[PDB]
Write a protein that binds this ligand. Structure first.
Ligand SMILES: Cc1cc2nc3c(=O)[nH]c(=O)nc-3n(C[C@H](O)[C@H](O)[C@H](O)COP(=O)(O)O)c2cc1C
Ligand SMILES: Cc1cc(Nc2ccc(S(F)(F)(F)(F)F)cc2)n2ccnc2n1
Ligand SMILES: O=C(O)c1cc(=O)[nH]c(=O)[nH]1
Length: 324
């Protein structure tokens, strides 16, 4: 109720200001004993993890892990924080977040703004949440290309003992992916021995992929025994927003206009992987019906983000109800 009642006022504000205000008010309402949402039990076992329900928070909403307890109170089966980088960085210049309400869409070029991995870990330590926490790790913008792998390694080591699973986003070039996965997988196996427990590694792709891309990525997932695949991140397409304000802004498009492309990408990977690697369906979930559609296209879990801006927090409850 609270969000949907405040939304007309908040939509009168610039998007990033409204975004930060909403998270701040969520935190305070949580501390006041408010914004607690009951969601149905739908136990789902995936990647060796017992999820209480199959609806997660996608990365990029809580980039620093500063809002975990308040977001957990919304009833997510799992929460993904990040993307986090080894050092803090500002991201791109503002404005960098655009609302396209007639299409129930968002365009962002945030640029991986974050407080750095040490601060994220302090935030996690101070949170009360003990459920399923995904941590999405990345590289600093100012790291030389030849040293990029080592930024992922720094984050991997620093978050290993705090994460339920770790996500790495991959770019569409093939040599670079293979080298990164070889190094990260070898290190993950070393850390699992050192810490006496296995933390699954999940890759996340964009939807703007050719058939050859899907085949290549699928082969890599299998060769390196990657534990799961998130399909998908935002799209470079502007289909569905070309005739609306902000529809020509550079960045990634999310919300309703990415539902069909992200779901088809999920379908293609599902056909290639043939049940061998769990799929996490993300993109354009604005109603529970869309979460069920991801599951029918092959997803075991889903994640939501942009639908929280439009439908609001009750979307968590709707998605759990709708999934089989
Ligand atoms: C403002 C904004 C910031 C995002 N930042 C991240 C990020 O830091 N890491 C990441 O993997 N995905 C990030 N995403 C992508 C979302 O996790 C998700 O894959 C995409 O938005 C599609 O889902 P949706 O249409 O339900 O929002 C971001 C999305 C938005 C809208
Ligand atoms: C009014 C508004 C809000 C918003 N972000 C947002 C952040 C958190 C939540 S929630 F309520 F997580 F529980 F706190 F769901 C909902 C929405 N954005 C983003 C771009 N424009 C926006 N306008
Ligand atoms: O920080 C960002 O710009 C960002 C990260 C990401 O993975 N996806 C996205 O759409 N934006």
């Amino acid at each position: 109720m609270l969000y949907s009642l405040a939304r007309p006022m908040l939509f009168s504000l610039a998007p990033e200001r409204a975004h930060e205000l909403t998270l701040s008010m969520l935190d305070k309402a949580h501390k006041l004993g408010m914004m607690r949402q009951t969601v149905e039990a739908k136990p789902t076992t995936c990647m060796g993890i017992e999820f209480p329900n199959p609806v997660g928070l996608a990365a990029g909403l809580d980039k620093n892990g500063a809002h975990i307890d308040a977001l957990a109170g919304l009833g997510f089966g799992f929460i993904e924080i990040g993307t986090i980088t080894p050092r803090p960085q500002s991201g791109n210049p503002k404005p960098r977040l655009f609302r396209i309400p007639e299409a129930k869409a968002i365009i962002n070029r945030m640029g991986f703004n974050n407080d750095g991995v040490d601060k994220l870990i302090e935030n996690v330590k101070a949170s009360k949440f003990r459920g399923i926490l995904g941590i999405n790790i990345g590289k600093n913008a100012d790291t030389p290309v030849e040293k990029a792998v080592d930024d992922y390694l720094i984050c991997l080591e620093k978050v290993y003992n705090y994460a339920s699973y770790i996500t790495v986003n991959i770019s569409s070039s093939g040599d670079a992916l293979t080298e990164l996965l070889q190094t990260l997988k070898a290190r993950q196996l070393e850390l699992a021995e050192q810490y006496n427990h296995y933390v699954p590694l999940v890759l996340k792709v964009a939807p703007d992929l050719t058939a050859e891309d899907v085949e290549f990525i699928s082969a890599q997932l299998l060769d390196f025994k990657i534990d799961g695949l998130i399909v998908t991140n935002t799209t470079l397409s502007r289909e569905g927003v070309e005739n609306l304000p902000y529809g020509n802004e550079s960045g990634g498009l999310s919300g309703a206009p990415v539902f069909e492309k992200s779901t088809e990408c999920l379908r293609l990977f599902a056909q290639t992987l043939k049940g061998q690697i769990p799929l996490i369906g993300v993109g354009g979930i604005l109603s529970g019906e869309q979460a069920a559609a991801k599951q029918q296209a092959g997803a075991t879990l889903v994640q939501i983000y942009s639908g929280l801006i439009y439908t609001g927090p009750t979307l968590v409850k709707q998605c759990v109800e709708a999934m089989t």
